[PDB]
Amino acid sequence: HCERLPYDASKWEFPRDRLKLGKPLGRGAFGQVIEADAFGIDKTATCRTVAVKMLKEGATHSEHRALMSELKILIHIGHHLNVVNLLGACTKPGGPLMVIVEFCKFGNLSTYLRSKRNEFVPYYKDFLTLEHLICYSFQVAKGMEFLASRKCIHRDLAARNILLSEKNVVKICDFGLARDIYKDPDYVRKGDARLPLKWMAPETIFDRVYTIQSDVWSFGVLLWEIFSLGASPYPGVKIDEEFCRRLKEGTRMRAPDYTTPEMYQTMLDCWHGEPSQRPTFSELVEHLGNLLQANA
Ligand SMILES: CNC(=O)c1c(C)oc2cc(Oc3ccnc4cc(OCCN5CCOCC5)ccc34)ccc12
Secondary structure, three states, X not given: OHHHOOOOHHHHEOOHHHEEEEEEEEXXXXXXXXXXXXXXXXXXXXXXXXXXXXXXXXXXXXXXXXXXXXXXXXXXXXXXXXXXXXXXXXXXXXXXXXXXXXXXXXXXXXXXXXXXXXXXXXXXXXXXXXXXXXXXXXXXXXXXXXXXXXXXXXXXXXXXXXXXXXXXXXXXXXXXXXXXXXXXXXOEEEOOEEEOHHHOOHHHHHHOOOOHHHHXXXXXXXXXXXXXXXXXXXXXXXXXXXXXXXXHHOOOOOOOOOOOHXXXXXXXXXXXXXXXXXXXXXXXXXXXXXXXXXXX
16 A cells, blocks of 8 residues: 655655666666666765666556555665665656666676576685575575565565675665566466466465565575575476476475575475464574574
C-alpha cells in the first residue's frame, strides 16, 4: 500500500540540470539504470558518480506509478550499509521520474563472482577467499534483517539483485523494470507473469504466498550462488511441473563447489519445507557472524 507513503521533496528532490547522464548499466523493456555524475548530491559542491533508475520508451504511466512507489518505499526503509542507498530523486513535472542511488563499483554479484573462478583461493592480491564469501553472506543477512525490521519483504532475492561496492561491501537492491525479464533465463513463464522460479519457496510457487520466510528460502539459493561462485541454480534441471513437484517432495540442490559443511547445512535450513521452521534473518545473522569468526 505504498501509494499512501510520503515524498518529502524538500529533503529528496535533486535538480535535473545537476545530473549528467552517461552510459547504460542495465536495460529492461520499460526501465533502465544509467550511470551519471551528480553535482553536490550528498556532499556540498562535490561531484559524485551515481546510478539512476528511470523509465524507457515503451513505458506507460502504470510503470511511472510503480517507480514512484519504489521511491516512496526506499524512503520508508531508510539507510543501512547493506541496502542500496537512496541519494535523491527527480520528480518535478517537465521531465522523467529519476531515482538516484549510490554507485556500486563492481555491479551485480552474480556476474562478478562468475568472473573470479580463476581468482579464488579458499585461504594472491585481489583474489577472492572463503572469508570474502562468508562475509558477503553475513552482510546480505544483515541487510535482510534490516529490511524485515522495516516491515518490508524483497520478493526477488538473488545474486543478480546484490551489488558489490568498494571495500567488500555488498548491498541488497532490486533492478526491477531495469531488467529484461522476458529475455532473462532466470525468469520463467508461469500463468500471466515471468517469475524467478528457481529462487522461489514452494508456498510461493503453489499458493502465491510471499513472506519474510519465503525470502529466507531465496536467501538459501543466494548462498548456493555465492558458494558456487555465481553458478546457475539447479544445474541440468528443466524448470517445469516436475521440478515444482519434486521441490515440494523434498528434493534439494547438492553442495556447491566452494562451500563449507556448515554453509551447506545453512542452505538446507533455509530450504525447510515449513516456512516457520526456517531460520529467521536474525538467526542467520547470529549464525553467519559465528561462522565468519570461526573462519578468522
Ligand atoms: C529498490 N531500488 C533499487 O533496487 C534500485 C534503484 C532505485 O536504482 C537501482 C540501480 C541499480 O543498479 C546499479 C546501482 C548501483 N551501481 C550499479 C553499478 C553497475 O555496474 C557497475 C559497472 N560494471 C562493473 C562490472 O563490469 C561491468 C560494469 C550496474 C548497476 C548498478 C540497482 C538497483 C537499483
